[PDB]
Design a protein around this ligand. Structure first.
Ligand SMILES: Cc1cc2nc3c(=O)[nH]c(=O)nc-3n(C[C@H](O)[C@H](O)[C@H](O)COP(=O)(O)OP(=O)(O)OC[C@H]3O[C@@H](n4cnc5c(N)ncnc54)[C@H](O)[C@@H]3O)c2cc1C
Ligand SMILES: Cc1cc2nc3c(=O)[nH]c(=O)nc-3n(C[C@H](O)[C@H](O)[C@H](O)COP(=O)(O)OP(=O)(O)OC[C@H]3O[C@@H](n4cnc5c(N)ncnc54)[C@H](O)[C@@H]3O)c2cc1C
Ligand SMILES: c1cc2cc(-c3ncc(C4(N5CCCC5)CCCCC4)s3)ccc2[nH]1
Ligand SMILES: c1cc2cc(-c3ncc(C4(N5CCCC5)CCCCC4)s3)ccc2[nH]1
Lengths: 482, 482
């Protein structure tokens, strides 16, 4: 065995393939389930396939339709606007198929590829060059197989974080929310993270009759780590779409109600009744059931310590993915995988660039972002220029949704022109931000944007539309031209 | 007078402003109308504002809603799918307002800006340093004003081309189609140009009862000049949306019918009855009513001869826009304007880069494109690599619209890796192609794409998803790896 991969997810699969396909090595892959769903949720394919980016983007598309059927009327589409309702059981059916279809696929991929073996079970390190597979999570379960090898890849990804608080066992995570029989009727998503904000919008689209969605977050504004303009705007726009966002509130305990309701008590002492309570306040690496001490693999701040080339600390042992407790995205786990394998089984070693990484939040409206934010950048850089346009696009001036401001924001190191970050809020911003991600990889300057000839009319042309900064940050304080 | 601008459009306005706003020069601007509509159509704002990109993109959004209300059902949106119909009179109302709002705007812009004067009428060159404004098109009309100046900018843009053929006076152009009282019931758009293809899709969305849209084009396939993959796919997809595309057919004559219908006879001898006949087979510069010979300004191949800096041939006289008979897009006329003025009234001369220009076709599905196509490039370049992905996105596997293939195609000069062209077909392709337009300006190579970390899930990530060419063109012939 040239390599063993624990975790058949975004990261592990990508390297389990490649390494076999391109370097003719043969490898073993371990995951715990096969198909999506209870009781383990994450199957073959990984978190992103079974319970992540894929299943959720379908639902968010499903949800976005609420806005179309409404805004269509502005361009003269008429019908019985009293006979429309969305059936959540449907949206789950189509989802399931898709995931299972991807599930059923990776199944065959193992069937037909030489030098690629998979076994069901819980794989856990046993010694520097050997990995066990028990029957269960417990390290004293039925040993299924015992794989010896020259190389290990740790790729177990993450798992929802549920706070110690009592009544916790009455709250679910995103996982269980993929499988709700009924849709929630009054719901609390807890946290300001994208996961919370995205599900907030889904739930708000499949809202029954007297339905209401409630978001709470302990800090001052949703989506911490994002440019403040996006945070303000999305906040107003979610509000405008009848989502209740409660800032500076957090559950102290969860009490099960008289009927079947749940009654949440916050720190503030505020009490609210809901039908559902979904935690989303973070995800933790799945390092426990791995049992690394049997080999001596260093943990740190929650994630497996690693260097620039995914070399852990024990030679021959390796780690990438959510298990590293860095930025937990699928394409980052994939880039890390393809790099690892090239360096390990190849001629030209390579390291993953963790900078300028484009990302998106599929809220409604969505957000696309790449690079630094006004704050941070104002502190790493003596002089910072900010180019901002914040208007309501034509198409929305009609429609009805006058509140749907499109926000485009380029922030640069004003000393040379280099673009430090771009931030987008508005329809298709996720599609738009991808290109710019390539631009920044090329160390583009603001002039590279404004010299490019626009595509008219788009929302995107706004990125080539700004030549004169809206304001500057000099040595950390905001300044302007007189 | 520092400069006089004939034509208050995309090109002229952009330079009429700037030159005043930034160089404190004062200038005169001439257009013929004020508000959009009959009898001249193009008012203050230009062709793109009054009867172009702006009014039509609103309609195409209006049209696209047909697809949403249908595809929504797949994600479990239900309603009386027998009680829905679109009211075209509405779609016109909202349009009008918008244009007039832009119209009403440019009005004030003249009110409040010092060093910027506008007069109604037909402005026509009279002598090397003086421009007349008659009351009408005819060069023997009531002289309104007589402006002398140091500099002229020719910017009269274009005008629909109606073939000499008889019965022509029973056909309209895109112009009159902005103002149709009723919507057409059976319609012939004539030509394979974007204008034809876009209106084809609009009309097909506002189709009455026994409605049908028919596109005809004399050549082999719609959209000549576009990558063949896009041409094939869009063709199938328009077909699939119940548009009738007749290839190798062209009108010989147009006969007015018994009732009110129109009966078209093609070259082939095929006879078809329609309600509307819209020509769209080209637009010609508006050089006639200008009367340039009074100063000696050279015409060539239909467009006013110009060099790299818009210098015509007579010093002090200048030309940009559709009047140059090159690529007739709004942002190209704007880039040319902003350059002209910098060079003329400034410290640092500049020339417009006419290459790598990103553009879009707002068909349904839409197309976004930048750079060369498989053909051309295969002939300017000894070795050419083509990277192609052509699948049906998840969201459409459900929905119903299984026929909605997303096409992403990178074509490169395989000798160094440089990206020669990118071609997109599928929803939001216009938004996606804008970024890449910046990438190519930066002389990106294919590795700059595939090294960029994707944004998952998007359609756009497909541009970072292809490392291994699908096929090559060596010295002009198609080749592959064994
Ligand atoms: C609700 C939600 C939505 C998300 N949406 C997005 C998005 O839109 N875009 C995006 O980029 N990212 C998204 N993410 C994050 C993304 O899913 C992760 O970054 C990605 O899955 C990381 O891949 P990985 O291979 O490192 O981890 P995983 O794919 O989780 O790999 C670990 C897998 O191996 C299995 N496993 C775990 N422990 C063991 C063990 N001890 N033995 C054997 N097998 C084991 C598990 O079943 C798990 O599936 C989302 C996450 C969540 C929770
Ligand atoms: C239906 C349609 C859709 C289009 N859609 C798009 C699109 O989506 N994207 C895109 O990039 N491009 C589009 N175009 C093309 C785009 O409109 C042109 O490239 C752009 O308008 C060129 O601007 P211009 O200033 O050079 O010409 P214009 O803006 O036409 O400038 C000339 C103006 O001056 C006036 N004028 C003309 N002659 C005289 C005279 N002798 N004296 C005084 N005034 C005069 C006219 O009213 C005219 O409006 C479209 C064109 C059409 C017809
Ligand atoms: C239905 C079929 C299907 C097929 C696949 C893939 N086959 C090969 C895949 C590749 N990688 C990473 C996951 C290990 C494979 C390798 C081939 C190019 C595409 C990616 S993905 C992925 C999901 C699928 N759903
Ligand atoms: C409603 C208001 C309104 C305002 C304008 C513009 N004002 C200034 C404009 C600018 N140019 C080119 C057209 C000459 C102006 C100059 C200011 C920056 C934006 C472009 S555009 C353009 C369209 C408008 N519709």
């Amino acid at each position: 065995f040239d390599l063993v991969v624990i975790g058949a997810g975004s990261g592990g699969l990508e390297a389990a393939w490649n390494a076999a396909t391109l370097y003719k090595k043969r490898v073993a892959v371990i995951d715990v389930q096969m198909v999506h769903g209870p009781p383990f949720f994450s199957a073959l394919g990984g978190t992103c396939v079974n319970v992540g980016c894929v299943p959720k983007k379908l639902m968010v598309t499903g949800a976005q339709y609420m806005e179309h059927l409404r805004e269509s009327a502005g361009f003269g589409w008429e019908f019985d606007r009293t006979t429309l309702r969305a059936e959540w059981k449907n949206l789950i059916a189509v989802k399931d198929e898709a995931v299972l279809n991807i599930n059923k696929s990776y199944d065959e991929m193992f069937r037909d590829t030489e030098g690629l073996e998979f076994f069901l079970g819980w794989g856990s390190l046993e010694s520097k060059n050997v990995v066990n597979v028990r029957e269960s999570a417990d390290p004293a379960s039925a040993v299924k197989e015992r794989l010896e090898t020259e190389h290990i890849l740790l790729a177990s990804g993450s798992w929802p974080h549920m706070p110690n608080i009592p009544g916790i066992e009455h709250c679910i995570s995103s996982n269980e929310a993929f499988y709700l029989p009924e849709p929630p009727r009054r719901v609390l998503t807890v946290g300001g993270g994208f996961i919370s904000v995205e599900f907030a919008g889904i739930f708000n689209a499949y809202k029954p009759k007297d339905g209401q969605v409630t978001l709470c977050y302990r800090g001052e504004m949703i989506l911490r780590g994002f440019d403040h303009t996006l945070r303000e705007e999305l906040t107003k726009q979610l509000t405008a779409n009848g989502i209740q966002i409660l800032t500076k509130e957090n559950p102290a305990k969860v009490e099960l109600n008289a009927d079947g309701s749940k009654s949440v008590t916050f720190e503030s002492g505020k009490k609210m009744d809901f039908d559902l309570v979904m935690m989303a306040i973070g995800r933790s690496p799945r390092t426990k059931d791995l049992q690394l001490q049997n080999a001596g693999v260093m943990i740190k701040n929650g994630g497996v310590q690693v260097d620039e080339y995914s070399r852990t600390n024990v030679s021959n042992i390796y780690a990438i993915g959510d298990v590293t407790n860095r930025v937990m995205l699928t394409p980052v786990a994939i880039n890390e995988a393809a790099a690892l394998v090239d360096t390990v089984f190849g001629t030209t070693p390579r390291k993953t660039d963790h900078t300028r990484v484009a990302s998106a939040v599929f809220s409604i409206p969505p957000i696309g972002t790449c690079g630094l934010i006004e704050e941070v950048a104002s502190k790493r850089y003596e002089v910072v220029a900010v180019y901002l346009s914040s208007f309501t696009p034509l198409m929305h001036k009609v429609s009805g949704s006058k509140y749907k401001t499109f926000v485009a924001k380029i922030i640069t190191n004003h000393s040379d022109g280099t673009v430090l970050g771009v931030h987008l809020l508005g329809d298709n911003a996720p599609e738009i931000i991808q290109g710019i991600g390539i631009c920044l990889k090329l160390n583009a300057k603001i002039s590279d944007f404004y010299n490019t000839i626009g595509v008219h009319p788009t929302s995107a042309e706004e990125l080539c539309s700004m030549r004169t900064p809206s304001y500057y940050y000099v040595k950390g304080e905001k300044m302007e031209k007189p």
